[PDB]
Amino acid sequence: GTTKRVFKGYEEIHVPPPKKRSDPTDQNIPVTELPEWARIPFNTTKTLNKIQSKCFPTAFLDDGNMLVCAPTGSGKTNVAMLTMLREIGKNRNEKGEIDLDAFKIVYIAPLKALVQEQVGNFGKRLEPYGIKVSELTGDRQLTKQQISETQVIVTTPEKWDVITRKATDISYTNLVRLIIIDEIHLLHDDRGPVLESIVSRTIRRTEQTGEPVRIIGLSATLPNYRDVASFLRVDFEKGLFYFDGSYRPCPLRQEFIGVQLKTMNDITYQKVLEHVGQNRNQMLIFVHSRKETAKTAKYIRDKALEMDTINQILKHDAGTREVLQEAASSVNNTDLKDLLPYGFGIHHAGMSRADRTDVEDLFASGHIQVLVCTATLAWGVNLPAHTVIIKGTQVYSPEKGSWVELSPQDVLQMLGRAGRPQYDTYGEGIIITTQGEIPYYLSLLNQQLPIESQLVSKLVDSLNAEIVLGNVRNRDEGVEWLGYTYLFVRMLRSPGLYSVGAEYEDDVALEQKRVDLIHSAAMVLKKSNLIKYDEKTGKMQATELGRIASHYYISHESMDTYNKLIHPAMNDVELFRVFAQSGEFKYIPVRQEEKLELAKLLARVPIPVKESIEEPTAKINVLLQAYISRLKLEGLALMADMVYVTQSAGRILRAIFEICLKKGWASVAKLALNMCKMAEKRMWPTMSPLRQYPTCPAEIIKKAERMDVPWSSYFDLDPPRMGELLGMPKAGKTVCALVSKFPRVEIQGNVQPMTRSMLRIELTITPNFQWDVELHGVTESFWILVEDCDGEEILFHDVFILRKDLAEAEENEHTVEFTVPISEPMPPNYFISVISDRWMHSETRMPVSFQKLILPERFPPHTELLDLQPLPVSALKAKDYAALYPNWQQFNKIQTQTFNSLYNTDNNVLVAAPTGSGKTVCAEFALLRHWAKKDAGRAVYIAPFQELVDLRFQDWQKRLSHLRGGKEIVKLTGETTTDLKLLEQGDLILATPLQWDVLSRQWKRRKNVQTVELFIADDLHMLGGQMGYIYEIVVSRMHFIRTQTELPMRIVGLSVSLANARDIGEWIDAKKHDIYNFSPHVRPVPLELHIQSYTIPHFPSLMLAMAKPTYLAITQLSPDQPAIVFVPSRKQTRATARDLLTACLADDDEDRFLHVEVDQIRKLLDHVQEEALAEALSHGVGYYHEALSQSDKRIVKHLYNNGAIQVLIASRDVCWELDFTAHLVVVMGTQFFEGKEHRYIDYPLSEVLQMFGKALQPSKDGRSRGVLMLPAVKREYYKKFLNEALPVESHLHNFLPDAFVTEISTKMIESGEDAINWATFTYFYRRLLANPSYYGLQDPTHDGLSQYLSDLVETTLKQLSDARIIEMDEDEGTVAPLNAAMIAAYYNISYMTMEMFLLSLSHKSKLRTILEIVTAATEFESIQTRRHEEGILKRIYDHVPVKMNNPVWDSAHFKAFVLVQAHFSRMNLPIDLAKDQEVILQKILSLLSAIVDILSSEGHLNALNAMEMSQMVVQAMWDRDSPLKQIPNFTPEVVKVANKYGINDIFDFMEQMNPEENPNYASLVKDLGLTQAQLAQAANFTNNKYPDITLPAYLKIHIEREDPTVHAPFYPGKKSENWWLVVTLLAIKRVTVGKELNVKLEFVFLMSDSYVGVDQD
């Protein structure tokens, strides 16, 4: 068939196009009448093509991966469309809309032009669905992350591979459920390994976890289609489609020409003559250089100008000849293209998009006959031509430095443009090349070039990536990975061309081959320090250097050289030298033709180049410099080499910068970041910063750079002063805008010395620049650096992100808390710098001076843990006391050392020992001595949190209620009138600090408070906890009491190992020998503690990343013992359960943590209330968090203690309530997000010690284990305070208003001098002398201390008087409460909430007003905010009548405002939001009664609507509503059925449905549809639950009735029914009603609190 024709110079080979052969089988194309949802994208077509026909069934129904092969222009993108359509249908409602946050789809294309054309096409075609298609482009992660918040994303393989390597977007990467790979034949190219890595890791994860993501490959007509088909896991019967060149819509005639190359130009000119003059067909030529396009076009046109052949090519129509040049030459800006009046065109992507679209539209209209172009036009257009001419096939690739043949994908995409199907009946594709290249391209176009792997050239690096991801931990996992690559599939079959060696004859699945290959790669990876490699165990772990080598594409050799060369004294010269030394440019040669220009270029550059002027290193150096300087280069190969160098520089310089940053070298790090910016913005630091603005005209830059005004003098100016300073009035308004948007930040810093060697710094960053999305986007990144006074070492570094929402708000400031070490010969100062990550000259630098800093007191040694004889239980002189400890014959080493002081002495005692040592038995020693006394006074045990008092009560009530004739052990409750009688009725009272506070406030009254003889303060360190200031207050008040009354009162305190136990001891007035402060290493079961650091800036990605390491920790450190994993939130608890279950699925052991057969557990599993918890427990994991029901918690506890399940995942919010024990404790998170400040706050050391204190189960070696996973920045912090004792400091100085409100409500404090003596009884006062700088004390003198206390009490009294809570008589200097601190202390609401409650009474308060004012209380601001819980709040807000004045969607105020209304409307809620609603309902009643009393204090009578709202929220109803909602099972439709019968109130309902009365008993029972039991419950409510009985000039009132509780099944716990007495309206009285009452009120409306519609008028 092929005709060979030999000529003078060239040898033509014509291959005839095979016949269409399109109707041997009558495969009628589908009608494309699909459902209504899958038709709108196919706008301009009614019939699918022949290719899409056989793919439509599998595409639209079958989910399996597939691969189609066809010629270019055949219709593959439409089968990819069909796959996207099956997915959109998957995410579509029956007839409703589509949830677009549930799924993502990724389209991978080889070049940028194709991704842009594809994003445009798919945007147009998918816009009616609301789907937003976007291109994954950024120079920054801040752009790519926001681009990952879209539905379908189009990207290149390199960008996708690099965003997956960073692992900082896994939270969204997991949401992809479909991937399309266009032009897979790239696998043959040197970039194929990127595709290999992508698909290998994706398919491996899918086959491990079972989470399906569809893979569809669209390749070209090629031989090895079955290889890549199996490599994509497609079914050869149902997923593999292959089509001949006859399935091409326009058959392609192929002639090959082979010829140093002037004959090529002559042949192109003669073919232009033949095809445009004789055949009159427009044609396009493809060349491989932007300048060579116009070079060849100019040659052809000049050759046509001579010999007078131009009139054959030229069109002579009066229209074309007159319109073409008029609309093109007069409107073109390209000087070299301006030669287009002769029908010629150039299109090489180095021209304006305006000129580009003009050329394209002109070629489409038929005005251009010869269009010469680059490969950029081949990819991503819709411009076909009859004749395409690939002029030349050799191109320069600066990677290898040698001339390389053209990529086989470019020639195919080019020849695809040959022959427009609608106009032409055939196309012509010609390839001009050299003779020797003829057999290469022929076989390529005639389906004979096979695809081979190039992974061997990039294996090592790629392997390292899989190791940095945590996907490859050992050689076996690496072999599993390498078993999914294309190299493996190409090794299995046809291994001869690969130098396998043939020694692996019996290698069944090439297992040993992959093992050997991965070991050989990991050896080189280990030598270069990119990885730790256990050569024998097979274990391997990535390093920080390997992480840098993976996140950026840096080669292993280059990273090795960077590690070898970089040192802290490095300058800009040596930095450029290290850059040019990189191995990416070693093939780039220095040529003789380059020297004449290289000498000049080196003369121009500013940085000295010391290498030999003729060495490649100097060439690469001067190339980078000259690119920075924006020098014009008249050299072709030189320009190509520079383009390559500068494309690599972006990653090379960032890798160098991160290396310097992680080595702690400050100067080199800042210099490397500045060089990064130099190459990114293409400017030197000595040029004008205005060069960073693209819209800034060059005139301004030149004027500025010819000036000497420093950059800082541009800021804080207006347009007139700006123009005056700049010397250009016209520039005034312009430049002032640009500078106004330059990233600018003001910083402040506060220093508190935690210890003598570690300071804590609070940095306050406030942005000071106008935001603009064109150059800022939505976020702006910064670096926070902390340096020595010498600028030598980096003491702290982190990233700091400005969000556009947070940077534009009124409350504009951000806070950042960190810790830095310090040496006792203190340095003069530290430095803090906030430096932009992309902008140049954007740095705010602040000194932190230490001349005023005073370090805390040295710590004294811990008390020696003496080696005593373990005292037997018989040392107790009672048999019943010894029976309290069954089967115990001794006590531990610390219980015997405190025994004499606690059991034989009534002195005050302090015991400080690690968690889990047994301090409860010390408290029991004290209690046993107390109860031995015949008097046996009352004892009071206090614990920081109700969880702890409950755990203690459940134990002591069953173990000690039988001693010495029986003791009454009680625990307090919320309100006062009941636990006040529990105090008198009991001998041992357990309480929380606040509960006992409300009782000890009434001392010198309520005689039963002084009689307390024993006071146990457990977990005393928690005085520095969440609400620890009230704890400090109550213990100091007990001391003050036992000072006022002279009766003896013992105090015994228990805490974890302290660093400052002297002050806590002397505080409770304990003697020196009674203060036991043991080392934090004396725990009876030692604790092997591992620490893992994580450099991951995205929180969900960090959690997902830690997921698998904790599985490894559990399976390797505690393989046959229970483990407990703590997690930052209850929301993340189920997520971590699922992640750990999937990690179990990764190995072929799904029930790894399940030991008992599931059938025994099945009952409890059925009884689990949460379906996710039941699914987890089904496979032996389970979890525990505050939203769980009591039954769920008890089931989880029964399952974990019995050993049926091995792991237990608990949120950090339940670590005090968790009555569990493990051999291994994992601390996954160290931070938790607090929605109040929009930031992550660190775990307080208190709860880390608490969580690790549950690792009490030992092993063979007699020790327990813990692991602590944290961000790197935090490691040295926690590590420190896990090897040393815990410093406890007071925060009473930060809550003095809320303490004085209670000390002034009672007349304890009555003046300023009356408050200093109160402060002297506190722990804060004793701490002021030991750590004065922590609290702001300047001089450590009695004068200074007393003056500081005076200033503090005066500013607290000022905050209170300015808030209108107390009268402050400044003359006498006294204070008094004014009818508002009473309410505050009675309901214990915050003082800031009290001041906020002043906004009422202005005009007056209404129902809709009070509903909004209550939820604004600060108590609800503590409620957690789960990220991305918006929308489910807006949907609820749209379904409630009363609206907010100004919505703030992420505000806890708006959250409470909406949830209260959802409670009124009985709207269902998800579990976590329902828990938040419960928490709100717990306090809304207290807040509402406080508001009632506040309104009653003045004249206004809006408080009545507040009482109505109280009864509303009790009954979950609205103000105006049918009371029948209170009746059980009365859905709104039943209320409608009742209203149809004439029922309006519960009274009228009770009067109806009575046999022989109102004869509707027949139809009413039938229409209500209620069962007999529902009617019985309704009768239960209506009979004796809903009330029925009703009732200075003084008044007298009576009331009677026909009792214990209130019927309100939608409210957690409600005190018995109360009543209001309301006669600018004055009188109020609040009393409970029982059976009968007679009360007379004196004045100068009978309302309820729990039921509606019962109101005397």
Contact partner, 1492, from ligand ADP, Mn ion, none, Cβ < 5-8 Å per class = none
Instruction: Name the residue nearer to Mn ion (CB basis): 181 or 679.
Output: 181
> Rounded to 5 degrees, what are φ and ψ at 1018?
-90, 150
Within 10 A of 333 (CB to CB), how many other CB atoms are there?
Answer: 10
Find out whether 1276 is annotated in a ligand binding site: no
Contact partner, 402, from ligand ADP, Mn ion, none, Cβ < 5-8 Å per class = none
Are 1412 and 1484 a contacting pair, CB within 8 Å? no
How remote is the C-alpha of 221 from its chain's centroid? Answer: 44
Q: What angle do CA 1176, 1177, 1180 make, to 5 degrees?
A: 100
Q: Specify burial of residue 195 (Cβ count, 10 A radius: 0-12, 13-18, 19+).
A: buried
Nearest residue to Mn ion, by Cβ distance, number only:
182
Find out whether 75 is annotated in a ligand binding site: yes
CB of 918 to ligand ADP, least distance (A): 3
Contact partner, 803, from Mn ion, ligand ADP, none, Cβ < 5-8 Å per class = ligand ADP
Are 202 and 179 a contacting pair, CB within 8 Å? yes
Cα 907 to Cα 920: distance, rounded to the nearest angstrom: 18
| Strands 1123-1127 vs 1224-1227: parallel, antiparallel or unpaired | parallel
Find out whether 145 is annotated in a ligand binding site: yes
* Token output for 1214: 């339940």
CB of 736 to Mn ion, least distance (A): 49
CB of 1018 to Mn ion, least distance (A): 6
Instruction: Name the residue nearer to ligand ADP (CB basis): 286 or 481.
Output: 286
Find out whether 1427 is annotated in a ligand binding site: yes
Interface with Mn ion by CB under 5 A: which range of 178-186, 1144-1152, 1414-1422, 1614-1622? Answer: 178-186
Residue type for 1557, please? E
C-alpha dihedral sign at 505, 506, 509, 511? negative
Find out whether 1046 is annotated in a ligand binding site: no
Find out whether 1090 is annotated in a ligand binding site: no
Q: Helix 262-272 crosses helix 290-305 at what angle (to 10 degrees)?
A: 60
DSSP state of 474: B
Nearest residue to ligand ADP, by Cβ distance, number only:
918
Contact partner, 382, from Mn ion, ligand ADP, none, Cβ < 5-8 Å per class = ligand ADP
Residue type for 941, please? Y
Find out whether 920 is annotated in a ligand binding site: yes
C-alpha dihedral sign at 267, 268, 270, 274? positive
Q: Specify burial of residue 317 (Cβ count, 10 A radius: 0-12, 13-18, 19+).
A: exposed
CB of 1029 to ligand ADP, least distance (A): 23
CB of 18 to ligand ADP, least distance (A): 18
Contact partner, 800, from Mn ion, ligand ADP, none, Cβ < 5-8 Å per class = ligand ADP
Q: Which of residues 1298-1317 bind Mn ion (CB under 5 A)?
A: none
Chain positions contacting ligand ADP, by CB under 6 A? 45, 47-49, 52, 72-78, 382, 799-801, 803, 806, 891-892, 895, 913, 915-921, 1098-1100, 1238-1239, 1253, 1427
Find out whether 47 is annotated in a ligand binding site: yes
DSSP state of 328: H
Find out whether 49 is annotated in a ligand binding site: yes
Find out whether 1638 is annotated in a ligand binding site: no
Interface with Mn ion by CB under 5 A: which range of 179-187, 611-619, 851-859, 876-884? Answer: 179-187
Instruction: Name the residue nearer to Mn ion (CB basis): 309 or 892.
Output: 892
Instruction: Name the residue nearer to ligand ADP (CB basis): 1155 or 1427.
Output: 1427
Contact partner, 75, from Mn ion, ligand ADP, none, Cβ < 5-8 Å per class = ligand ADP
Residue 747 pairs in a beta bridge with: 765
Cα 1559 to Cα 1562: distance, rounded to the nearest angstrom: 7
CB of 1276 to ligand ADP, least distance (A): 19
307: left (phi over 0), alpha (psi -120 to 50) or beta: left
Look at residues 1094, 1460, 1068, 1091 and name the one whose alpha carbon lies nearest to residue 1281: 1091
CB of 1098 to ligand ADP, least distance (A): 5
Instruction: Name the residue nearer to Mn ion (CB basis): 109 or 1102.
Output: 109
Interface with Mn ion by CB under 5 A: which range of 177-185, 891-899, 1032-1040, 1617-1625? Answer: 177-185
Instruction: Name the residue nearer to ligand ADP (CB basis): 806 or 1599.
Output: 806
Find out whether 123 is annotated in a ligand binding site: no
Find out whether 801 is annotated in a ligand binding site: yes
Instruction: Name the residue nearer to ligand ADP (CB basis): 398 or 767.
Output: 767
- Mention every residue, 6+ apart, whose C-beta is less than 8 A from residue 280: none
Instruction: Name the residue nearer to ligand ADP (CB basis): 867 or 1166.
Output: 867
CB of 452 to ligand ADP, least distance (A): 23
Residue 759 pairs in a beta bridge with: 753, 820
Instruction: Name the residue nearer to Mn ion (CB basis): 181 or 229.
Output: 181
CB of 1553 to ligand ADP, least distance (A): 56
Are 582 and 558 a contacting pair, CB within 8 Å? yes
How remote is the C-alpha of 33 from its chain's centroid? Answer: 44
1069: left (phi over 0), alpha (psi -120 to 50) or beta: left
How remote is the C-alpha of 381 from its chain's centroid? Answer: 39
* Token output for 747: 């910083």
Are 1011 and 986 a contacting pair, CB within 8 Å? no
CB of 1213 to ligand ADP, least distance (A): 18
CB of 364 to ligand ADP, least distance (A): 13
- Cα Rg of the chain (Å, integer): 40
Instruction: Name the residue nearer to Mn ion (CB basis): 921 or 1106.
Output: 921
> Rounded to 5 degrees, what are φ and ψ at 1530?
-100, 75
Instruction: Name the residue nearer to ligand ADP (CB basis): 490 or 1130.
Output: 1130
Are 367 and 343 a contacting pair, CB within 8 Å? yes
Q: Specify burial of residue 861 (Cβ count, 10 A radius: 0-12, 13-18, 19+).
A: exposed
Find out whether 413 is annotated in a ligand binding site: no
Q: Specify burial of residue 1081 (Cβ count, 10 A radius: 0-12, 13-18, 19+).
A: middle
Interface with Mn ion by CB under 5 A: which range of 181-189, 291-299, 676-684, 697-705? Answer: 181-189
Cα 559 to Cα 571: distance, rounded to the nearest angstrom: 19
Contact partner, 891, from Mn ion, ligand ADP, none, Cβ < 5-8 Å per class = ligand ADP
Instruction: Name the residue nearer to ligand ADP (CB basis): 873 or 1535.
Output: 873
Instruction: Name the residue nearer to ligand ADP (CB basis): 635 or 918.
Output: 918
- Mention every residue, 6+ apart, whose C-beta is less than 8 A from residue 206: 212, 213
Contact partner, 1614, from ligand ADP, Mn ion, none, Cβ < 5-8 Å per class = none
Q: What angle do CA 1637, 1485, 1442 make, to 5 degrees?
A: 120
CB of 1123 to ligand ADP, least distance (A): 18
Q: Helix 1323-1330 crosses helix 1028-1044 at what angle (to 10 degrees)?
A: 110
Instruction: Name the residue nearer to ligand ADP (CB basis): 116 or 325.
Output: 116
CB of 1258 to ligand ADP, least distance (A): 11
Are 1074 and 909 a contacting pair, CB within 8 Å? yes
Contact partner, 48, from Mn ion, ligand ADP, none, Cβ < 5-8 Å per class = ligand ADP
Contact partner, 1053, from ligand ADP, Mn ion, none, Cβ < 5-8 Å per class = none
Dihedral in degrees, nearest 10, Cα atoms 660, 662, 667, 671: 50
Find out whether 262 is annotated in a ligand binding site: no
CB of 137 to Mn ion, least distance (A): 20
Which parts are annotated binding residues for Mn(2+)? 182-183, 1175, 1179
Which parts are annotated binding residues for ADP? 47, 49, 52, 73-77, 145, 799, 801, 892, 895, 916-920, 1098-1099, 1240, 1427
Binding footprint of Mn ion on the chain (CB under 5 A): 182
Which parts are annotated binding residues? 47, 49, 52, 73-77, 145, 182-183, 799, 801, 892, 895, 916-920, 1098-1099, 1175, 1179, 1240, 1427
